[PDB]
Amino acid sequence: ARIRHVQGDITEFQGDAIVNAANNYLKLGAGVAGAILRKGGPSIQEECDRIGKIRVGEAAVTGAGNLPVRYVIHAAVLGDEPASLETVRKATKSALEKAVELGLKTVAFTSWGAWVGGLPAEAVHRVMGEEIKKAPDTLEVTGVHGTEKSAEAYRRASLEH
Ligand SMILES: *[P@@](=O)(CCCCCCCCCCOC(=O)NCCCCCC#C)OCC
Ligand SMILES: [Cl-]
């Protein structure tokens, strides 16, 4: 699937779904997840509680409450196991699989930087990029970045080559 890189707040993404990097317990905290709790509202954690624990590397879908998307796809990158390039690969693939199963088109990711600080950044980018590339072209992916400088850096890299 194609990806477009933009600056923004993923909780303002208007489209079919946002991907939420998660622990496998599916319990939300601060950061992007905190914005989801607040802006999405109580139904998101309530539905996560109804799903219960999943395995690291899997994904699970909830509604999105008052967010401007239909679904939140929670992608379990760590929790009862530490993050690894393998868990990143599996969680990205699993999140995309859920989007395909739901018949979605537009899906947003963050860089997952705040979940992968112990892993080589270039490798994380490669593995996520590879899984997104392999996903069907029925999906259109948006990468949402905190700063314009960084969003543009991702765009420039997408040219070369
Ligand atoms: P910023 O703070 C960091 C700039 C990093 C530039 C990256 C260049 C190579 C990336 C190759 C592909 O990356 C991806 O495919 N990553 C996965 C998909 C996107 C995730 C969603 C996001 C958001 O700027 C400072 C100069
Ligand atoms: Cl994040």
Side-chain angles (χ1 to χ4, degrees):
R2 182 193 68 200
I3 180 158
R4 295 195 194 278
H5 296 278
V6 301
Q7 187 284 327
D9 175 352
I10 197 168
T11 64
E12 294 290 312
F13 181 72
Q14 296 181 66
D16 291 324
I18 63 173
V19 174
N20 181 52
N23 55 58
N24 69 298
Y25 316 100
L26 305 180
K27 311 304 189 189
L28 282 75
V32 170
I36 290 175
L37 288 174
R38 179 177 72 84
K39 297 171 64 170
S43 65
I44 297 173
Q45 185 64 68
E46 289 167 0
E47 195 175 346
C48 285
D49 288 358
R50 296 285 185 164
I51 292 166
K53 188 169 56 185
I54 66 176
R55 302 182 183 87
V56 173
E58 291 176 349
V61 179
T62 64
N66 298 313
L67 299 175
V69 293
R70 295 156 61 195
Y71 296 107
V72 177
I73 302 172
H74 307 265
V77 303
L78 57 74
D80 60 22
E81 303 172 18
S84 70
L85 292 174
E86 190 180 353
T87 74
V88 168
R89 188 178 294 280
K90 288 177 175 182
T92 302
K93 182 178 184 169
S94 293
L96 296 163
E97 288 174 343
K98 294 293 181 174
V100 174
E101 288 164 1
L102 288 167
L104 305 187
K105 179 182 304 181
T106 51
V107 181
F109 281 77
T110 75
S111 72
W112 292 7
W115 294 85
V116 298
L119 302 177
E122 179 177 348
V124 170
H125 298 157
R126 281 203 306 269
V127 296
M128 294 180 72
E130 282 171 1
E131 295 306 316
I132 291 162
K133 179 176 181 180
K134 291 187 293 194
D137 285 333
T138 53
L139 294 185
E140 298 172 357
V141 176
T142 298
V144 183
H145 306 272
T147 67
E148 181 61 28
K149 167 174 267 69
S150 212
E152 198 283 323
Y154 277 86
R155 295 198 289 273
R156 199 96 59 99
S158 78
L159 305 184
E160 307 145 30
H161 81 87

mmCIF file of all heavy atoms in Angstrom, residues 101-124:
data_model
loop_
_atom_site.group_PDB
_atom_site.id
_atom_site.type_symbol
_atom_site.label_atom_id
_atom_site.label_comp_id
_atom_site.label_asym_id
_atom_site.label_seq_id
_atom_site.Cartn_x
_atom_site.Cartn_y
_atom_site.Cartn_z
ATOM 1 N N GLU A 101 -9.522 -6.842 6.684
ATOM 2 C CA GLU A 101 -10.689 -7.651 7.066
ATOM 3 C C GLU A 101 -11.941 -6.796 7.207
ATOM 4 O O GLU A 101 -13.049 -7.244 6.872
ATOM 5 C CB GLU A 101 -10.424 -8.390 8.383
ATOM 6 C CG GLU A 101 -9.428 -9.535 8.267
ATOM 7 C CD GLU A 101 -8.891 -9.979 9.615
ATOM 8 O OE1 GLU A 101 -9.306 -9.409 10.647
ATOM 9 O OE2 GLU A 101 -8.042 -10.894 9.641
ATOM 10 N N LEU A 102 -11.772 -5.577 7.706
ATOM 11 C CA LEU A 102 -12.879 -4.639 7.877
ATOM 12 C C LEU A 102 -13.283 -3.914 6.587
ATOM 13 O O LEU A 102 -14.236 -3.134 6.586
ATOM 14 C CB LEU A 102 -12.510 -3.601 8.934
ATOM 15 C CG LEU A 102 -12.485 -4.129 10.373
ATOM 16 C CD1 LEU A 102 -11.813 -3.135 11.286
ATOM 17 C CD2 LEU A 102 -13.906 -4.392 10.821
ATOM 18 N N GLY A 103 -12.560 -4.153 5.497
ATOM 19 C CA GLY A 103 -12.855 -3.498 4.230
ATOM 20 C C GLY A 103 -12.559 -2.008 4.237
ATOM 21 O O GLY A 103 -13.214 -1.237 3.529
ATOM 22 N N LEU A 104 -11.561 -1.595 5.013
ATOM 23 C CA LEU A 104 -11.232 -0.177 5.134
ATOM 24 C C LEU A 104 -10.361 0.311 3.996
ATOM 25 O O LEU A 104 -9.760 -0.475 3.277
ATOM 26 C CB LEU A 104 -10.495 0.085 6.445
ATOM 27 C CG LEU A 104 -11.199 -0.386 7.718
ATOM 28 C CD1 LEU A 104 -10.451 0.082 8.956
ATOM 29 C CD2 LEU A 104 -12.657 0.058 7.745
ATOM 30 N N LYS A 105 -10.286 1.627 3.858
ATOM 31 C CA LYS A 105 -9.376 2.237 2.901
ATOM 32 C C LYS A 105 -8.317 3.062 3.636
ATOM 33 O O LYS A 105 -7.119 2.750 3.600
ATOM 34 C CB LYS A 105 -10.142 3.116 1.913
ATOM 35 C CG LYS A 105 -9.238 3.801 0.886
ATOM 36 C CD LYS A 105 -10.013 4.717 -0.070
ATOM 37 C CE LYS A 105 -11.123 3.979 -0.801
ATOM 38 N NZ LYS A 105 -11.845 4.877 -1.747
ATOM 39 N N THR A 106 -8.756 4.078 4.364
ATOM 40 C CA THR A 106 -7.812 5.055 4.909
ATOM 41 C C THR A 106 -7.435 4.753 6.348
ATOM 42 O O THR A 106 -8.296 4.671 7.231
ATOM 43 C CB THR A 106 -8.374 6.479 4.775
ATOM 44 O OG1 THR A 106 -9.698 6.515 5.321
ATOM 45 C CG2 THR A 106 -8.441 6.889 3.291
ATOM 46 N N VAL A 107 -6.138 4.572 6.583
ATOM 47 C CA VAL A 107 -5.637 4.169 7.885
ATOM 48 C C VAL A 107 -4.403 4.992 8.229
ATOM 49 O O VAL A 107 -3.518 5.150 7.384
ATOM 50 C CB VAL A 107 -5.239 2.673 7.875
ATOM 51 C CG1 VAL A 107 -4.751 2.246 9.242
ATOM 52 C CG2 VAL A 107 -6.415 1.797 7.460
ATOM 53 N N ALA A 108 -4.342 5.503 9.455
ATOM 54 C CA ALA A 108 -3.206 6.319 9.897
ATOM 55 C C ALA A 108 -2.352 5.594 10.930
ATOM 56 O O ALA A 108 -2.876 4.878 11.792
ATOM 57 C CB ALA A 108 -3.688 7.635 10.483
ATOM 58 N N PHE A 109 -1.041 5.805 10.857
ATOM 59 C CA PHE A 109 -0.075 5.330 11.847
ATOM 60 C C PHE A 109 0.698 6.522 12.388
ATOM 61 O O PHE A 109 0.862 7.523 11.683
ATOM 62 C CB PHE A 109 1.003 4.447 11.197
ATOM 63 C CG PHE A 109 0.603 3.023 10.903
ATOM 64 C CD1 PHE A 109 -0.202 2.724 9.817
ATOM 65 C CD2 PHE A 109 1.125 1.975 11.650
ATOM 66 C CE1 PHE A 109 -0.521 1.403 9.520
ATOM 67 C CE2 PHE A 109 0.806 0.665 11.351
ATOM 68 C CZ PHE A 109 -0.012 0.382 10.288
ATOM 69 N N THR A 110 1.227 6.392 13.603
ATOM 70 C CA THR A 110 2.351 7.211 14.050
ATOM 71 C C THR A 110 3.648 6.448 13.781
ATOM 72 O O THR A 110 3.625 5.313 13.310
ATOM 73 C CB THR A 110 2.292 7.521 15.546
ATOM 74 O OG1 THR A 110 2.666 6.336 16.266
ATOM 75 C CG2 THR A 110 0.899 7.959 15.969
ATOM 76 N N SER A 111 4.785 7.068 14.093
ATOM 77 C CA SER A 111 6.081 6.434 13.860
ATOM 78 C C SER A 111 6.393 5.336 14.865
ATOM 79 O O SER A 111 7.368 4.597 14.695
ATOM 80 C CB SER A 111 7.196 7.469 13.937
ATOM 81 O OG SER A 111 7.371 7.849 15.284
ATOM 82 N N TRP A 112 5.593 5.257 15.927
ATOM 83 C CA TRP A 112 5.811 4.321 17.038
ATOM 84 C C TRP A 112 7.104 4.594 17.801
ATOM 85 O O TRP A 112 7.530 3.767 18.613
ATOM 86 C CB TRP A 112 5.790 2.847 16.575
ATOM 87 C CG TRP A 112 4.449 2.344 16.104
ATOM 88 C CD1 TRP A 112 3.317 3.082 15.920
ATOM 89 C CD2 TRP A 112 4.106 0.989 15.769
ATOM 90 N NE1 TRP A 112 2.292 2.274 15.480
ATOM 91 C CE2 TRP A 112 2.752 0.987 15.377
ATOM 92 C CE3 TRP A 112 4.819 -0.215 15.750
ATOM 93 C CZ2 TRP A 112 2.090 -0.171 14.976
ATOM 94 C CZ3 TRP A 112 4.163 -1.369 15.339
ATOM 95 C CH2 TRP A 112 2.807 -1.340 14.968
ATOM 96 N N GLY A 113 7.721 5.754 17.562
ATOM 97 C CA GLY A 113 8.989 6.084 18.193
ATOM 98 C C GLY A 113 8.985 5.924 19.697
ATOM 99 O O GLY A 113 9.959 5.450 20.275
ATOM 100 N N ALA A 114 7.882 6.308 20.332
ATOM 101 C CA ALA A 114 7.797 6.247 21.784
ATOM 102 C C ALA A 114 7.630 4.823 22.332
ATOM 103 O O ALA A 114 7.599 4.623 23.545
ATOM 104 C CB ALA A 114 6.670 7.146 22.285
ATOM 105 N N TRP A 115 7.540 3.843 21.436
ATOM 106 C CA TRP A 115 7.364 2.441 21.818
ATOM 107 C C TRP A 115 8.593 1.597 21.485
ATOM 108 O O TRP A 115 8.661 0.426 21.871
ATOM 109 C CB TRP A 115 6.157 1.859 21.077
ATOM 110 C CG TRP A 115 4.855 2.474 21.494
ATOM 111 C CD1 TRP A 115 4.295 3.623 21.020
ATOM 112 C CD2 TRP A 115 3.972 1.976 22.505
ATOM 113 N NE1 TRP A 115 3.105 3.876 21.671
ATOM 114 C CE2 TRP A 115 2.879 2.863 22.576
ATOM 115 C CE3 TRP A 115 3.991 0.852 23.342
ATOM 116 C CZ2 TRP A 115 1.831 2.678 23.475
ATOM 117 C CZ3 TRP A 115 2.933 0.653 24.213
ATOM 118 C CH2 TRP A 115 1.868 1.567 24.274
ATOM 119 N N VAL A 116 9.554 2.183 20.770
ATOM 120 C CA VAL A 116 10.660 1.407 20.191
ATOM 121 C C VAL A 116 12.034 2.016 20.455
ATOM 122 O O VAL A 116 12.972 1.780 19.699
ATOM 123 C CB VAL A 116 10.485 1.206 18.652
ATOM 124 C CG1 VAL A 116 9.217 0.407 18.356
ATOM 125 C CG2 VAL A 116 10.469 2.540 17.912
ATOM 126 N N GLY A 117 12.178 2.754 21.548
ATOM 127 C CA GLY A 117 13.408 3.484 21.816
ATOM 128 C C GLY A 117 14.658 2.645 21.997
ATOM 129 O O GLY A 117 15.774 3.161 21.917
ATOM 130 N N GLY A 118 14.485 1.358 22.259
ATOM 131 C CA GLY A 118 15.618 0.470 22.451
ATOM 132 C C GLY A 118 16.023 -0.258 21.179
ATOM 133 O O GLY A 118 16.934 -1.092 21.198
ATOM 134 N N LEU A 119 15.356 0.063 20.074
ATOM 135 C CA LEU A 119 15.612 -0.596 18.794
ATOM 136 C C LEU A 119 16.215 0.403 17.811
ATOM 137 O O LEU A 119 15.962 1.610 17.915
ATOM 138 C CB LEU A 119 14.310 -1.172 18.219
ATOM 139 C CG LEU A 119 13.571 -2.178 19.104
ATOM 140 C CD1 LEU A 119 12.280 -2.607 18.455
ATOM 141 C CD2 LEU A 119 14.438 -3.393 19.388
ATOM 142 N N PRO A 120 16.998 -0.085 16.838
ATOM 143 C CA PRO A 120 17.588 0.825 15.849
ATOM 144 C C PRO A 120 16.489 1.483 15.012
ATOM 145 O O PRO A 120 15.666 0.778 14.420
ATOM 146 C CB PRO A 120 18.437 -0.104 14.968
ATOM 147 C CG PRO A 120 18.605 -1.355 15.750
ATOM 148 C CD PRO A 120 17.411 -1.484 16.631
ATOM 149 N N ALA A 121 16.480 2.814 14.969
ATOM 150 C CA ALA A 121 15.426 3.562 14.291
ATOM 151 C C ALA A 121 15.315 3.216 12.807
ATOM 152 O O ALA A 121 14.209 3.035 12.294
ATOM 153 C CB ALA A 121 15.640 5.063 14.465
ATOM 154 N N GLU A 122 16.450 3.099 12.134
ATOM 155 C CA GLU A 122 16.452 2.786 10.713
ATOM 156 C C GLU A 122 15.812 1.421 10.456
ATOM 157 O O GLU A 122 15.051 1.249 9.503
ATOM 158 C CB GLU A 122 17.879 2.843 10.161
ATOM 159 C CG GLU A 122 18.014 2.512 8.679
ATOM 160 C CD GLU A 122 19.442 2.646 8.171
ATOM 161 O OE1 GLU A 122 20.286 3.219 8.896
ATOM 162 O OE2 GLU A 122 19.724 2.178 7.047
ATOM 163 N N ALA A 123 16.084 0.462 11.335
ATOM 164 C CA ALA A 123 15.509 -0.867 11.201
ATOM 165 C C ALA A 123 14.009 -0.863 11.462
ATOM 166 O O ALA A 123 13.264 -1.536 10.761
ATOM 167 C CB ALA A 123 16.212 -1.836 12.138
ATOM 168 N N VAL A 124 13.564 -0.120 12.470
ATOM 169 C CA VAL A 124 12.142 -0.002 12.737
ATOM 170 C C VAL A 124 11.422 0.563 11.509
ATOM 171 O O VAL A 124 10.389 0.037 11.082
ATOM 172 C CB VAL A 124 11.866 0.881 13.983
ATOM 173 C CG1 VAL A 124 10.391 1.198 14.103
ATOM 174 C CG2 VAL A 124 12.369 0.189 15.255
#
